[PDB]
């Protein structure tokens, strides 16, 4: 029917949800931004269910249905008011026609998205793509609107109860993230972690062998080290990449007092060389085009009601589609006929946007901006959390997987998001066999909330460190 | 209409209490209803009270049961939950 | 030499600061910062002279004579050294590679821009990139070096002495943005200045006529007007008039039982479009991409820095070069003969960039990230102010035009800024015809001063409303 | 080479005699000379007494001048100044 959230501006905004709270009574008991949740969802008998399950559709089903229960009712309702709010619908659809050129990196490489490995560049052009679309439309309203620049956590807290099983995730995830770093010798890597850290004289006379010597990749060691070291440990290493450098074209060129300046003059070239190839292999390193693809939920989101050619008029339906898909575990099977069914002439083309079975590498790598039935919830957290046709009806509650990052992470209320996050992940566990998935959602929701992440709504992406490197306590 | 629909309710009702405190009543038939409906556009919402008649073991007996049925007429998807929310003898 | 001017914060750099000011003795008698100016300048001689004067290349002489005269001795002193400190030499050099993708809009886009006019994006991404620029390399350490964002004073004390001098500037300054047209009458601009405050009755019955009446060209007046206010008050109005068309729909739907529900549904649609197409207007009209020409002083000198390859190390040449030439005024020709045979290459390079006679139409509307010949003013009053390499020389005097904000605008002193500027407008009156320059320099600086600039090194962009609107009094 | 290079600064000395303090000296020749300069790094000042022999019409008579000389040694342009500071009869 037609959108019930008027609204243009902050102060609007707050009327409405202000006026919205005390006809529901909504809550932040266990939420970082009010919501239905008065209660943290018990997803024990999901346990017991798919340990007694045999058949794998019902382990699904299990699955999938204890998901629904943890995100029913903790969805950060003022955001995702916003973000579905008459003003940022009109100005987020419009914003991608008055900038398709910008996009097309990505954008018109689509259908070769689908399939194929996205390049950096569509990677880098997207994010800065979602952060101008974010700025240009003024997205930002509070810190739960916000685009991270911060730092990841070194100490997580959680309930003693589950430390071991968090710990236990993270051995899974570093185990991964070690996949994905390979493999160049460890050796190597000491030698440059060592040597920035101040010792730069074994350059004269590498321990390994030669300063050039190149082993089965076709280059030399020193390049792969670095690019290594900087995959591992951030962009700063080439900086001091600089600094470290003093010694190079000083004591060989500057230094006319100590060493040669014939046959050494050269020597600055040498490891100069490897260095720029060093920041060339990280650049398309495994782990920076993975990080890269990072995704970015609403500005995805709009994108892909962009693609379907919604208009602020039909979007509505969209929003009750993604409520009721989100209202009661409904397997993708029955998604794609209600797509395929409705008169609306999006779910069709919305449809034909899948990606699934198209993709061939592992789906770490997928572009952000390929729509999967899986990331449908990327969607769902924006617009089915509150059906804009109906917002009342929101009480009746409607979950979508990234909702669960609106639960509280202190410890006065016992960290219910860790909690939840880690039952899914012993649900998955007891269901499924995890070493064998390309991606734990769980694991992945943990991770957000080790960058710090509060809201779905949050871009995470120029967070700077390791998350994984974080301590439990 | 809604004389076709209660029975099933009871049955329900009855097959529910069976589980519920493990026994073998069996549904012999209905004799009072009360219905209380609350519709707004898309959400219904739907309490009954009921009294039945069943069998345990061969005597025939009364009971005072009370339903809630909550229903959402969706476009993509219409949603019906019951819950046997009381089941007493009289 | 090198760079001795060892500063990475704001402690080192107070210090550094009392350090030089006690063994040079620095006044502020005169000035908003402490600089050598121990006396207003007087440029009397010079008027007399550019009267005397008949070849055209003794007046540039003349003129140039004057303005290094007038900027000679009060440089901001603080915030000069502050601009040039090694701290912020390196994070403003290095943060160009470490953002070259933010601004690729007008970087990579650079040979074309050096003839063409750009396009807003461009001017909008350059402004956006120029903010963060400050921001990432914490620029700011006072005042005189903020990014102002508050409004136009619309009230200007000056001498009796001056007066007639400066509305006649003022005068001049008007007529050139009247050149922004090619004329809407005036009622029109009363009409929705009054429309907007929130009087949609007036809609019914339009003085002129009807709502729909068009001018000439033979668009809608309504949006010509909106069009014409947003420029005068501000990108709000497109809001703010919007609005007071939500207050006629609802008055048409009380009303609706008296008044058609037919051709009065169409008088809300068509004042929509009118607010479109004013926004439309608005977008493109010559005042906006002018007001977001400015060019921003010390982010386009790093800039062309970066562009013409120097390092923190090469630098101090650059402000050596940039001394020498403020110190003494030497013409064009005798820059572009030094900046080639210089042993450093980057004198080589940097001259590559200029696009002076390129241009074709009006030069206000070259991009502010394109130097030319003209622009190199630019820089030095960042870098040739004070002499890195050896600053003590700085005492010698260098003048650049903007060192003039650095003069007092206030009634204590009788305002020396506006004398100076208005002797300058005076000079180039005296010896050319200010109607067929392109560009007045004494105008442009008035114009800042009239924005509540005080150092070169202000942001005056995110600034509100219109300069010329000012009054003498 | 001093003797072969020193006379220049008189010649202009009277020139500036003639044009501020009106008048159309003409210059013989330079017999005393006394330099006295302060040089740091690139900062050069240099103040000259010189007297001069120069032709009022006619008669040759000497003349006590004096002159400031400042330059700065550059990377890009060497610069010079020139300024009498004193020029009277003896």
Same mark, same amino acid.
């Given at each position: ?13 707050? =009327? ?79 914003? /991608? ?9 990505? &954008? ?47 100490? $997580? ?7 071991? @099983? ?37 350059? /004269?006379?590498?321990?390994?062998? &030669? ?39 000083? $004591? ?32 398309? @390193? ?15 989101? $709009? ?17 009750? /589609? ?7 575990? %409904? ?19 919305? $449809? ?6 198209? /993709? ?14 899986? %990331? ?21 509650? @409607? ?19 860790? %909690? ?21 959602? @769980? ?20 967070? =700077? ?9 | ?13 009855? #097959?529910?209490?069976?589980?519920? +405190?493990?026994?073998?009543? +069996? ?28 069998? #345990? ?6 009971? +005072? ?9 969706? #476009?993509?998807?219409? #949603?019906?939950?019951? +819950? ?7």
């Amino acid at each position: 029917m037609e959108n019930k959230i008027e609204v243009n501006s902050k102060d609007e905004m707050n =009327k409405w949800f202000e006026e919205f709270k005390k006809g529901n009574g909504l809550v932040d008991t266990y939420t970082n931004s009010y919501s239905f949740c008065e209660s943290v969802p018990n997803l024990d008998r999901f346990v017991f269910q798919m340990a007694g399950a045999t058949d794998d559709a019902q382990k699904d089903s299990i699955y999938a249905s204890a998901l629904v229960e943890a995100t029913k009712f903790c969805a950060p309702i003022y955001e995702c008011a916003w973000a579905s709010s008459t003003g940022i619908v009109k100005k987020g659809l419009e914003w /991608f026609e008055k900038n398709t050129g910008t996009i097309k990196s990505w &954008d018109e490489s689509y259908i070769e998205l689908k399939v194929e490995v996205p390049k950096i560049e569509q990677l880098f052009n997207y994010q800065q793509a979602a952060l101008k679309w974010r700025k240009d439309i003024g997205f930002r309203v509070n810190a739960n609107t916000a685009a991270l620049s911060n730092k990841v956590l070194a100490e $997580y807290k959680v309930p003693g109860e589950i430390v071991m @099983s968090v710990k236990e995730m993270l051995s899974d995830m570093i185990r991964r993230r070690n996949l994905i770093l390979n493999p160049v010798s460890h050796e190597h890597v000491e030698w440059c972690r060592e040597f920035v850290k101040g010792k730069y004289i074994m350059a /004269f006379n590498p321990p390994w062998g &030669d300063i050039n010597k190149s082993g089965r990749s076709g280059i030399a060691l020193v390049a792969t080290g670095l690019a290594k070291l900087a995959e591992t440990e951030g962009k700063g290493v080439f900086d001091e990449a600089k600094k470290t450098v003093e010694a190079l074209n000083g $004591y060989l060129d500057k230094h006319k007092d100590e060493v040669d300046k014939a046959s050494a003059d050269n020597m600055v070239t040498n490891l100069l060389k490897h260095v720029a190839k060093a920041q060339e292999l990280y650049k398309n @390193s495994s782990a920076l085009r993975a990080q890269g693809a990072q995704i970015d939920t609403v500005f995805s989101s $709009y994108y892909w009601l962009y693609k379907a050619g919604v208009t602020p008029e039909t979007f509505p339906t969209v929003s009750q /589609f993604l409520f009721e898909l989100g209202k009661h575990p %409904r397997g993708t099977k029955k998604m794609k006929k209600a797509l395929l069914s409705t008169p609306m002439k999006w779910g069709k083309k919305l $449809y034909e946007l899948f990606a699934d079975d198209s /993709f061939q590498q592992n789906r770490i790598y997928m572009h952000p901006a390929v729509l999967t039935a899986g %990331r449908i919830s990327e969607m769902g957290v924006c617009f089915g959390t509150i059906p804009v046709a109906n917002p009342d009806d929101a009480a009746l509650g @409607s979950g979508h997987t990234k909702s669960i990052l609106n639960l509280r992470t202190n410890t006065e209320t016992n960290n219910p998001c860790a %909690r939840t996050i880690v039952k899914l992940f012993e649900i998955q566990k007891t269901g499924f066999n995890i070493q064998d998935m390309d991606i734990v959602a @769980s694991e992945h929701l943990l991770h957000q909330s080790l960058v710090g992440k509060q809201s779905p709504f949050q871009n995470a992406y120029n967070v =700077k460190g390791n998350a994984t490197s974080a301590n439990i306590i | 209409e809604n004389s076709l629909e209660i029975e099933e309710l009871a049955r329900f009702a009855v #097959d529910e209490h069976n589980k519920k +405190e493990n026994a073998l009543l +069996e549904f012999v038939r209905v004799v009072k209803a009360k219905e209380q409906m609350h519709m707004k556009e898309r959400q219904i919402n739907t309490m009954y009270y009921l009294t039945l008649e069943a069998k #345990d073991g061969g005597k025939k007996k009364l009971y +005072e049961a009370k339903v809630w049925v909550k229903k959402y007429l969706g #476009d993509f998807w219409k #949603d019906n939950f019951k +819950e046997l929310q009381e089941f007493k003898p009289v």
